[PDB]
Amino acid sequence: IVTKSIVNADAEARYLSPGELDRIKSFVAGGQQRLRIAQALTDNRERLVKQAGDQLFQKRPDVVSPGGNAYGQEMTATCLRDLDYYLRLVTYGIVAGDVTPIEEIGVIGVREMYKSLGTPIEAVGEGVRALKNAASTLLSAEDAAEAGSYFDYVVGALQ
Amino acid sequence: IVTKSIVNADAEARYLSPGELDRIKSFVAGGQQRLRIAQALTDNRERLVKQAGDQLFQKRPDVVSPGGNAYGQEMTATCLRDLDYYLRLVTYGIVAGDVTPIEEIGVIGVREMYKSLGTPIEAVGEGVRALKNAASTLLSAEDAAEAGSYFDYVVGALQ
Amino acid sequence: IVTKSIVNADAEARYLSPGELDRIKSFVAGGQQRLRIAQALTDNRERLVKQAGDQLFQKRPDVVSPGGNAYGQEMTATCLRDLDYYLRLVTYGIVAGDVTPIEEIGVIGVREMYKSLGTPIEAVGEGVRALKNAASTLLSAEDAAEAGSYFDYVVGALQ
Amino acid sequence: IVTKSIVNADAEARYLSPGELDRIKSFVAGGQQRLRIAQALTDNRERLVKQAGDQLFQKRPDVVSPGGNAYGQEMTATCLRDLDYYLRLVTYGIVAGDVTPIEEIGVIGVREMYKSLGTPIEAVGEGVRALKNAASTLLSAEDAAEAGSYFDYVVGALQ
Amino acid sequence: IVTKSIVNADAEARYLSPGELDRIKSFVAGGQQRLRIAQALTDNRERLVKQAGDQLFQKRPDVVSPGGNAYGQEMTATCLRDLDYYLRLVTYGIVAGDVTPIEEIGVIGVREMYKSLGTPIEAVGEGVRALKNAASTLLSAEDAAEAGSYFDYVVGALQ
Amino acid sequence: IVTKSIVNADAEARYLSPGELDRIKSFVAGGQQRLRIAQALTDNRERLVKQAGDQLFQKRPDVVSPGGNAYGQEMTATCLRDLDYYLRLVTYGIVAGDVTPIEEIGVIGVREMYKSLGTPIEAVGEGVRALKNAASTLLSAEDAAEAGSYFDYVVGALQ
Amino acid sequence: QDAITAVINSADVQGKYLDTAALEKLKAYFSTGELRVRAATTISANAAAIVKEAVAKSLLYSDITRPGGNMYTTRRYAACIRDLDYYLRYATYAMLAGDPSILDERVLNGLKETYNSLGVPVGATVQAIQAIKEVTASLVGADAGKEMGIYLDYISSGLS
Amino acid sequence: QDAITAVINSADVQGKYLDTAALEKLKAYFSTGELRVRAATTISANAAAIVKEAVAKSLLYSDITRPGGNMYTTRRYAACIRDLDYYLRYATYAMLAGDPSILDERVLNGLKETYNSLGVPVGATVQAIQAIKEVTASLVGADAGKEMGIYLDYISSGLS
Amino acid sequence: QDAITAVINSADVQGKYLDTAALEKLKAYFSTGELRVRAATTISANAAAIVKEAVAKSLLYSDITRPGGNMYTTRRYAACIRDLDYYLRYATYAMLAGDPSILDERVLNGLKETYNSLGVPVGATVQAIQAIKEVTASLVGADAGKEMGIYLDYISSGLS
Amino acid sequence: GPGINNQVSNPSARGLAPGSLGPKVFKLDQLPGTIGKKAAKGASVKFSESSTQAVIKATYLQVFGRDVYEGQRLKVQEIKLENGEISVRDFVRALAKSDLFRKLYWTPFYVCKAIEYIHRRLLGRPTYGRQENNKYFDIASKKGLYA
Numbered sequence A, B, C, D, E, F: 001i002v003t004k005s006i007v008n009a010d011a012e013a014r015y016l017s018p019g020e021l022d023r024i025k026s027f028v029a030g031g032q033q034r035l036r037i038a039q040a041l042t043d044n045r046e047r048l049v050k051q052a053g054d055q056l057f058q059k060r061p062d063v064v065s066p067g068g069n070a071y072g073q074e075m076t077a078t079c080l081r082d083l084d085y086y087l088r089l090v091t092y093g094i095v096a097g098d099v100t101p102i103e104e105i106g107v108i109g110v111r112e113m114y115k116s117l118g119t120p121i122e123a124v125g126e127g128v129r130a131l132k133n134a135a136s137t138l139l140s141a142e143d144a145a146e147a148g149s150y151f152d153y154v155v156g157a158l159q
Numbered sequence G, H, I: 001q002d003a004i005t006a007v008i009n010s011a012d013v014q015g016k017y018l019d020t021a022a023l024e025k026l027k028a029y030f031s032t033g034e035l036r037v038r039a040a041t042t043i044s045a046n047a048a049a050i051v052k053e054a055v056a057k058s059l060l061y062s063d064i065t066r067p068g069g070n071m072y073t074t075r076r077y078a079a080c081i082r083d084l085d086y087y088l089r090y091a092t093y094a095m096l097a098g099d100p101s102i103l104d105e106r107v108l109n110g111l112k113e114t115y116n117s118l119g120v121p122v123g124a125t126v127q128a129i130q131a132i133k134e135v136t137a138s139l140v141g142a143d144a145g146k147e148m149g150i151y152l153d154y155i156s157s158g159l160s
Numbered sequence J: 001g002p003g004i005n006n007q008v009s010n011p012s013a014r015g016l017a018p019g020s021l022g023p024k025v026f027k028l029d030q031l032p033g034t035i036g037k038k039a040a041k042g043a044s045v046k047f048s049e050s051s052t053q054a055v056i057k058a059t060y061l062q063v064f065g066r067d068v069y070e071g072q073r074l075k076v077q078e079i080k081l082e083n084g085e086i087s088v089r090d091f092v093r094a095l096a097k098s099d100l101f102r103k104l105y106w107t108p109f110y111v112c113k114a115i116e117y118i119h120r121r122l123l124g125r126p127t128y129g130r131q132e133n134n135k136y137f138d139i140a141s142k143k144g145l146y147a
C-alpha cells in the first residue's frame, strides 16, 4: 500500500500528501493483526484446500466427470495445487494490505490462460468462494471479514 | 479524500481497490478528531488573525511602510481579511482530509493574482506561518501536528 | 347537497347516479342531527360571538389599537356583527350540507371588499377560528368535528 | 372515483370542493359492501360464464352456426374467454366505484376491434346481459342492483 | 369524618371523645341530605362542567389564546376533563365530610404538577370558582352553602 | 419610455411613428431636469426615510404596537429598509421617465408578498405618502410635482 | 336552487334566521324526499321506454313524421328523441330539488326562441310532454306521478 | 393514478383477478382514508400560513432575498410563493390519492430543466420544501405528517 | 463532488464557517460510510451476475432481442451489456460519494441526445435499470439497497 | 384522449369528447343574471354563478398557464363575459390581446418560438410543419401579433 501511495504521488510532481501519511501510519498500526491473520491462514493450508475441494466437487461435479478438465488423480492434484496457489496469493495480499502483489501474480492474465487450458473460470471462482467459506469458519469475525475482503477480490477477479 | 480515490479509480476502468476502501474507512474513523480540530480552529478565529498580524508586522514592516501594499487602516483590514480567508480554507482542508477543496479555492491561481495586486507572496507565506504558530500554541500536540499539516501545505503553496 | 348533485348531473347528459342517490339518502338520515346542531348554535349566538371576538382581541390587539380599524365602540360593534354574520352563514352551511350558501353569501368576493374597507383579512380569519374553537367546546365531540369542519372551510376560504 | 374528482377539481384551479369530499367519504363507507360484492362475483366466475354461454347460444344460434364467428371448440372457447374478460372488468368497476378503469380497458375502442374481427357487437351485448341475469340470480337484491349497474354500463357501451 | 377523628384520637393515647361521637352522630344525621346533594351533582355533570368552563373562558381568554395552554380542541377537551375531575372530587368530599379524599387525590401535589405542565394555577382556580357559582345556582340555598364551601376549600387550596 | 414606444410599435408591423419620435425627443430634452431631481432625492435619502417613519408611526401606531408587524428594533429597521427600497425605485422611475422599471421591481407582485408577510398594505401606502410629503418639502414646486407623479403611482399601486 | 336553498334565500332576504316556520317546511321536504328518491330510481330505470311509449302514443303516424313534416328527417327524429329525453331528465332533476327554478333557468331560458327560429311546432311538443306525463304517472305512482307532472306541466307551460 | 387504480392496474396487466393480497391493499387504503381526508381538510385550512411560516423559517433574512439573490425582485418573491404553494397543493393531492404518480406526472416531469434554465437555486428549494414538511407535520400531527413528509420528500428527492 | 465537498462548498459560498448543521451532515456521512463501503465491496463482487440477472429479468425473450428489435445484432447486445455495466458502476460511485453530482456530470449529461439519435428505446432502458435496482437491493440488503435505488432511480428519472 | 380519434385519423371526429384520458373541458353554461321570467331578482344564493366563475378561472389557467396575480386580472372583460354579451372565444381573444400576454409571451422570445408557444396555448396542439409556420409568420409580418 506504500507503493500505491508512492506511485500515486509520483505521477504528480507533489510530495506525499499527509493524508496518505496518515493511511500509511494506520496500516503500520494494523500490520500486527495482518501478520497474525496471515500466519493463521499459513499453518492451516491443507485443511483449507481439502474443504475447498470438498465444497467445489460437491458443487460442480463436471470437473469430476470425464468430459471436464480435472478428471483423474493427476488432474485433480493439479486442481488442488491451483487452489493452493490462490490461497498463497491471498496471504500475500493480506500482508501487503492492498491487492497489487496478488493481482500481479494471479489475476492480470488469468482469463486467457484458463481459456487456453480448457478449464472454466467459474469453477475456479467457486473454489475461491469455498476457500473463503472455510477460512471464515477457521477465523474469528473481525479476522474472517478482513480475509473475506481479499478472497472477495479474487472471486470478483476470476469472474 | 473520497473524490480523490473515486477519480483515481475512475481514470482506470477498475473498481475501487479495497486498499482504497481501507483508507476511506480509516478517514471515516478519524473524522471525529477532524471535526473537533476544525471547531477549535473555528471558534477562536479572532485570536488567530490578531496573533498572525502581530507576528507578521513584527517580522516584515514593509507592508506597514507606505511603499508597501498594506498601508493604512483599509489596506491592513484587507490584509487581515486575507488571513481570515486562508484560515477558513485551512479549516475546510482539515475537514476534507485532503488538500483538494483548499487548493481549488486558494492556491491554484494565487501567484498571478498577488502579482497583479502588487503584494509580495512571501509575506503571505509568513502570515500563514504565523497562523500555524498561533494554532500550534492553541492546540494540543497531536492536534497541532495535524493542523500544521495543512498550514504547511499552504505555506509551501504560496512560495 | 341536492343542488350540487343536480348541477353536476346537469353538466353531463345523464341522470342522477346511484352513488349520488346514496349521498342524498345519507344526507337525509343525518339531517335531523344537523338540525340539532343548528338548534344549539342558534340558541348560543350571544356568548359564542362575544367569546370569539374577545379571543380575537386577546390574540390580535392591532385591530383595537388606535391605528387599527376596530377602534371605538361603533367599530367594534360592527366587528362583532361581522362575526355574527359569519356564524349565521356557518349554521346555514351546516343545515344545507353544501357550502354554496356560505360561498355565494359571504365568501366569493370578500377579499376585494375587505381590501377596500381597510380591514385585514387575517384578523377576520382568526376571529372565525375563535368561533370554531368556541363552538367546538360547546357541542358534542364528533358533532363538533362536523361544525368545526364547516368553520374550517370558512377560515381557509377567507385567507 | 377519487381520480374523477381529482382531475375534475384539477382542470379548475380550485381545490377539491367539500361536497366532493363528502362523496369520497361516502364511497369510503360503502367500500366494504363493494368488496364483498366483488369477491362474490370473483369466486363464482365459471358458473357465470357457463350460464352466460347457455343463455347466449340459446338466444343467438348464429355464432353456433358455421357462418358465424364462434364456430368450433376453439372459437367458442375464445368466446367464453371474452365473456370472462368482461366479467373481470365488471369486478374492477365494482371495486373502483366508477366506470373509468373498466371503460379504459374494455369499451373505448371495442367497436372497431370487433368490426375487424368479424364478430357482431349485439351478440356481445346479449352475452353481458346474460351475465347480468346470472349475477342477479346469484346475488341479493341490493347486491344485484349494484352489480347490474356496471353490467348495464357495459351493455349500453357495447351497443 | 370518622378517619380524621380516629387518627386524631390515635395521636393521643385515649379513646374517641363524647364530643367527637356527637360529631359522628350529627354527620350520620346529615348524611342522607349529603347523598341527595351528590345525586343532584352526579346527574348535572355535563352542563355544570360546560357552563363553568365557558364562564372561565369568558373571564380568562388567555388560556384559549394561541399563546395559551388550552389552544385547540384536544387541549380544551383536557381542560374540561380537569374540571370534571375536580367536580368529581368535590362530590367525594361532600359525601365523606372530610376533605382528605379531595386532598390526597387532587390537592396535595398540584402546584408542582401544573408548574411542570405549563398551566397557570389561577385559571384552574377561577374555573373551580365558576363550578362553585354554577352548582350554587342549581341547588337549594343552604344546601348550596354546603356544596360551595367544599368548592371553597378546593379553590383556596389550589391557589 | 423608449422601450414602451419600441414594444408599442413592435406589436404592430409598422415603424416608430414620428409622434413617438417627438415624445422621445422631448423626454431627451427633459432628461437633465430628471437627473437633477434624481440626484437631489439620492443624496438626501436618510432624511426622507426618517421623516417618513416619523409621519407613519405618528399616523398608524399599530406597527409600533406589539400585535403589529413592525414591533421591536429589528422589525422597525426592516420597515425603514422597505421605505428605503421604495424611495430607490421612485428614483429609478424618475430617471426612466415611465413607471415600467419601478413597477417591474416593486408593484407587480407586492400584494401577495405583503399578505404572506402579515403586514398591511395600507400602512405601506401611507409610508409612501409620507415620503411624497417629505420630498415635496425638500424640492421646488416644479420638482415636487414631477416627483409626486411617481410617488403617486406607488401610492395608487400599493392600494 | 333546491327547496332548501329557496327557504334559506327567503329567510336571508328577510335577514332573519331559520325558526319554526322554515323548519317545518324543511321537515315537510324531508318527508317527501324519501319517495322522491324512490321515484328517481324508478324513472332512471326505463327512461328510454318512457320516451319510446310517449312518441309511439303521440307523435308517430302523423303528418309531422310524414314527408313534409318537422320530424321527417332522420337527424330531426333523433333531435326529437333527445329533446324528450331531456325533458324527462330535467323534470327528474326538478322533482328531486323540489323546486322548478333550476329547470326554468336550464331549458326555458332560450328554448322558446330556438323553437321559434327553427320552425319547430309548439303544440306537438306540448302533446309529447303530456304523453310523457301520462306514461310516468302510470309507471311510478299516484303522488310521485303528480309530483313529476307538476314540473312536466311547468315545462309545457313555459314552452307555450 | 390512485392506490386503488394502481392495484387494479397491477392485477390487470397480468390478467389476474383480484386475489387476497390486492384486497388487503384496498382494505388498508380504506382504513387509512379517514385520517387522509382529515389531514387534507386541515392542510386546505391554512396553506398560506404554512407557506408563510416556511419562508420565515428557511428563506427569509438570508442572502436570497438580498440583492443578488434569486428572490430579490418582488415578482421573483411572488413566483417563490407560487412554487411553494404548488408543492404543498400537489403533495396534498398525492397524500389523498395515496400514490405519488401525480407528482411524477404533473410536478416532477420537466422541473429540473426549468430550474436549471432560470438559474433557480435547487438546494434552497429543497430546504424550503423541508421547512414546509416540518411545519405541516407539526400542524397535522405525526401520524398524517409521516405520509405528508413522504410525498414532500419525494418532491425533494426528485428535485435533487 | 462529495457530500463532504458539497457541505464545504455550501459553507464556502456564504463565507460561513463550519456551523453545527454542517458538522451534523458530516457526522451523519461518517456514520453511514461503514455500510457504504461494505455495499460497494459486495456490488463490486458480482457486477456481471447482476447485469446477467437484470437482462434475464427484463430484456430477454422479448421482441427487443428478436430481429427488428434494438438488441438483435450481437454488437448491439454487447453495447447493451456495456450500458448496463456503466449504469451500475456509476451508481456505485454515486453511492460511495453520497452525492449524485457525478451521475449528472458523467452519465446524464448528453445521454437523451445519444439515445434519441441512435433510436435506442428509452422505456426498455428504464425497465432494465429498474431490474438492476431490484437485483442489487435483493443482493445487498434493504438498508443499503435504499441508497443504491436512490441513485439508480435518479438515472432512470433523468433518462426519462 | 382516446387513441381512435387522432385528428390525422378521423377528420369527422374533431368535436368529440376528450374522454377520461384527456384533461377536463369547460363549457360555459347557466349564465348568471337570467333568473326566470316572473318578477323577483331579490335572491341571495343563485347557485349558477358559483359555477360560472370557475370557467373564468380556467380561461386564465389555459391561456396563461398559471393563475395571474391579484393586481392583473382583467376585470372589465370578466364582468363583460358575466353580463352575457362577450362569449368564451371572444374572452379568449380579448385575453390574448392584453398587455400581460404580450409582455410574457411575445416580448422576451424569438418570433417563431413565440408563434409556436401561442399555438401551444390557444389551439392546444403543436404546429404540424412549415405549412403553418411561415403562414402565421407571414401573417406576423404585415399586421403583427394581433393578427
Ligand SMILES: CCC1=C(C)/C(=C/C2=NC(=C\c3[nH]c(/C=C4\NC(=O)[C@H](C)[C@H]4CC)c(C)c3CCC(=O)O)/C(CCC(=O)O)=C2C)NC1=O
Binding pocket: A056, A063, A068, A069, A070, A071, A075, A076, A078, A079, A080, A082, A083, A085, A086, A089, A105, A106, A110, A117, A118, A119, A120, A121, A123, A124, A127
Ligand atoms: C500462482 C499463479 C498461477 C496460476 C493461476 C496457475 C494455473 C495453472 N493451472 C494449470 C492446470 C490446470 N488447472 C486446472 C484447474 C482447475 N480444476 C478445475 O476443474 C477448476 C476449473 C480449476 C481449479 C479448481 C486443471 C484441471 C489443470 C490441468 C489441465 C491440463 O492438464 O490441461 C497449469 C498448467 C500445469 C502446471 O504447470 O501447473 C497452470 C500453469 N499457475 C500459476 O502459477
Ligand SMILES: CCC1=C(C)/C(=C/C2=NC(=C\c3[nH]c(/C=C4\NC(=O)[C@H](C)[C@H]4CC)c(C)c3CCC(=O)O)/C(CCC(=O)O)=C2C)NC1=O
Binding pocket: B056, B063, B068, B069, B070, B071, B075, B076, B078, B079, B080, B082, B083, B085, B086, B089, B105, B106, B110, B117, B118, B119, B120, B121, B123, B124, B127
Ligand atoms: C479565499 C481566496 C481569496 C484570496 C486569496 C483573495 C485575495 C485578495 N486580496 C486582495 C487585496 C489585498 N491583499 C493584500 C494582502 C496582504 N497584505 C500584505 O502586505 C501581505 C502581502 C498580504 C496579507 C498578509 C493587500 C494589502 C490588499 C489590498 C491591495 C489593494 O488594495 O490594491 C483582493 C482585492 C480586494 C478584495 O476584493 O478583497 C483579493 C480578491 N481573495 C479571495 O477571495
Ligand SMILES: CCC1=C(C)/C(=C/C2=NC(=C\c3[nH]c(/C=C4\NC(=O)[C@H](C)[C@H]4CC)c(C)c3CCC(=O)O)/C(CCC(=O)O)=C2C)NC1=O
Binding pocket: C063, C069, C070, C071, C075, C076, C078, C079, C080, C082, C083, C085, C086, C105, C106, C117, C119, C120, C121, C122, C123, C124, C125, C127
Ligand atoms: C354576510 C357577509 C357580510 C360580511 C362579512 C359583511 C361585512 C361588513 N363589514 C363592514 C365594516 C367593518 N368590518 C370590520 C371588521 C373587522 N374588524 C377587524 O379588524 C376584524 C378583522 C374584522 C372583524 C371580523 C370593521 C372594523 C368595520 C368598520 C369599518 C368602517 O366603518 O369603515 C361593513 C360596512 C358597514 C356595515 O354595513 O356593517 C360591511 C357591509 N357584510 C356582509 O353582508
Ligand SMILES: CCC1=C(C)/C(=C/C2=NC(=C\c3[nH]c(/C=C4\NC(=O)[C@H](C)[C@H]4CC)c(C)c3CCC(=O)O)/C(CCC(=O)O)=C2C)NC1=O
Binding pocket: D056, D063, D068, D069, D070, D071, D075, D076, D078, D079, D080, D082, D083, D085, D086, D089, D105, D106, D110, D117, D118, D119, D120, D121, D123, D124, D127
Ligand atoms: C379485456 C379486453 C379485451 C377484449 C374485449 C378482447 C377481445 C378479443 N376477442 C378476440 C376474438 C374473438 N372474439 C369472439 C367473440 C364472440 N363470440 C361471439 O360470437 C360473440 C360475438 C362474442 C362473444 C360472446 C370470437 C368468436 C373470436 C374469435 C374470432 C377469430 O378467431 O377470428 C380476440 C383475438 C383473439 C385473442 O387474442 O383472444 C381479442 C383480442 N381482448 C381483450 O383483451
Ligand SMILES: CCC1=C(C)/C(=C/C2=NC(=C\c3[nH]c(/C=C4\NC(=O)[C@H](C)[C@H]4CC)c(C)c3CCC(=O)O)/C(CCC(=O)O)=C2C)NC1=O
Binding pocket: E063, E069, E070, E071, E075, E076, E078, E079, E080, E082, E083, E085, E086, E105, E106, E117, E119, E120, E121, E122, E123, E124, E125, E127
Ligand atoms: C383528579 C386530579 C387530576 C388533575 C387535576 C389532573 C390534570 C391533568 N391535566 C393535564 C393536562 C392539561 N390540563 C390543562 C388545564 C387547564 N387549562 C387551563 O388553562 C386551565 C387553567 C386548566 C383547566 C382547569 C391543559 C390545557 C392541559 C393540556 C396540556 C398538555 O397537553 O400539555 C394532564 C396530562 C394529560 C392527561 O393525562 O389528561 C393531567 C394528568 N389529572 C388528575 O388526575
Ligand SMILES: CCC1=C(C)/C(=C/C2=NC(=C\c3[nH]c(/C=C4\NC(=O)[C@H](C)[C@H]4CC)c(C)c3CCC(=O)O)/C(CCC(=O)O)=C2C)NC1=O
Binding pocket: F056, F063, F068, F069, F070, F071, F075, F076, F078, F079, F080, F082, F083, F085, F086, F089, F105, F106, F110, F117, F118, F119, F120, F121, F123, F124, F127, H056, H060, H061, H062, H065, H066, H072, H073, H074, H077
Ligand atoms: C425592492 C422590492 C422589495 C420589497 C417591496 C421587499 C419587501 C420585504 N419586506 C420584508 C419584511 C417586512 N416588511 C415590513 C413592512 C412594513 N412595516 C410596516 O408595519 C408597514 C406595513 C411596512 C413598511 C412601513 C415588516 C414589518 C417586515 C418584517 C416582517 C417579518 O419579519 O415577518 C421582507 C422579508 C425580510 C427581508 O428579506 O427584507 C421582504 C423581502 N423586498 C424587496 O426587495
Ligand SMILES: CCC1=C(C)/C(=C/C2=NC(=C\c3[nH]c(/C=C4\NC(=O)[C@H](C)[C@H]4CC)c(C)c3CCC(=O)O)/C(CCC(=O)O)=C2C)NC1=O
Binding pocket: H064, H070, H071, H075, H076, H077, H079, H080, H081, H083, H084, H086, H087, H090, H106, H107, H108, H111, H114, H118, H120, H121, H122, H124, H125, H128, J066
Ligand atoms: C407544479 C410544478 C411547477 C413548478 C414548481 C413551476 C415553476 C416555475 N418557477 C418559475 C420561476 C421562479 N421560480 C422561483 C422559485 C425559487 N427560486 C428561489 O430562489 C427559491 C429557491 C425558489 C422558491 C422556493 C423564482 C424566484 C422564479 C422567478 C424567475 C423569474 O421569473 O424571473 C417559472 C418561470 C415562469 C413563471 O413563474 O411564471 C416556472 C415555470 N411550474 C410548475 O408547473
Ligand SMILES: CCC1=C(C)/C(=C/C2=NC(=C\c3[nH]c(/C=C4\NC(=O)[C@H](C)[C@H]4CC)c(C)c3CCC(=O)O)/C(CCC(=O)O)=C2C)NC1=O
Binding pocket: I064, I070, I071, I075, I076, I077, I079, I080, I081, I083, I084, I086, I087, I090, I106, I107, I108, I111, I114, I118, I120, I121, I122, I124, I125, I128
Ligand atoms: C456512462 C454513460 C454512457 C452511456 C449509457 C453511453 C451509451 C452509448 N450507447 C451506445 C449504443 C447502444 N446502446 C444500446 C443500449 C440499449 N438499447 C436497447 O435496446 C436497450 C434498451 C439499451 C440497453 C439496456 C444499444 C443496443 C446500442 C447499439 C447501437 C449501435 O451501436 O448500433 C452508444 C453509441 C456508440 C457505442 O456504444 O460504443 C453510446 C455512446 N455512453 C456513455 O458514456
Ligand SMILES: CCC1=C(C)/C(=C/C2=NC(=C\c3[nH]c(/C=C4\NC(=O)[C@H](C)[C@H]4CC)c(C)c3CCC(=O)O)/C(CCC(=O)O)=C2C)NC1=O
Binding pocket: J002, J003, J004, J005, J006, J008
Ligand atoms: C401515418 C404514420 C403514423 C403512425 C404509424 C402513427 C402512430 C401512433 N401510434 C400510436 C399508438 C399505438 N400504436 C400501437 C401500435 C403497435 N403496437 C404494437 O404492439 C404493434 C407492434 C404496433 C401495431 C402494428 C399501439 C398498440 C398503440 C397504443 C398505445 C396507447 O395508445 O396506449 C400513437 C399515439 C396516439 C394515438 O394512436 O392515437 C400514434 C401517434 N401516427 C402517424 O401519424
Ligand SMILES: CCC1=C(C)/C(=C/C2=NC(=C\c3[nH]c(/C=C4\NC(=O)[C@H](C)[C@H]4CC)c(C)c3CCC(=O)O)/C(CCC(=O)O)=C2C)NC1=O
Binding pocket: J110, J111, J112, J133, J134, J135, J137, J138
Ligand atoms: C426577426 C428575425 C427573423 C428572421 C431573419 C427569420 C427568418 C426566416 N427566414 C425563413 C425563410 C427564408 N429566408 C430566406 C433568406 C435568405 N436566403 C438567401 O438566399 C439570402 C442569403 C437570405 C435573404 C437575404 C429565404 C430565401 C427563405 C425561403 C425558404 C423557403 O421558405 O422555402 C423562414 C422560414 C419560414 C418563413 O419565411 O416564413 C424564417 C423563419 N424569422 C425571424 O423571426
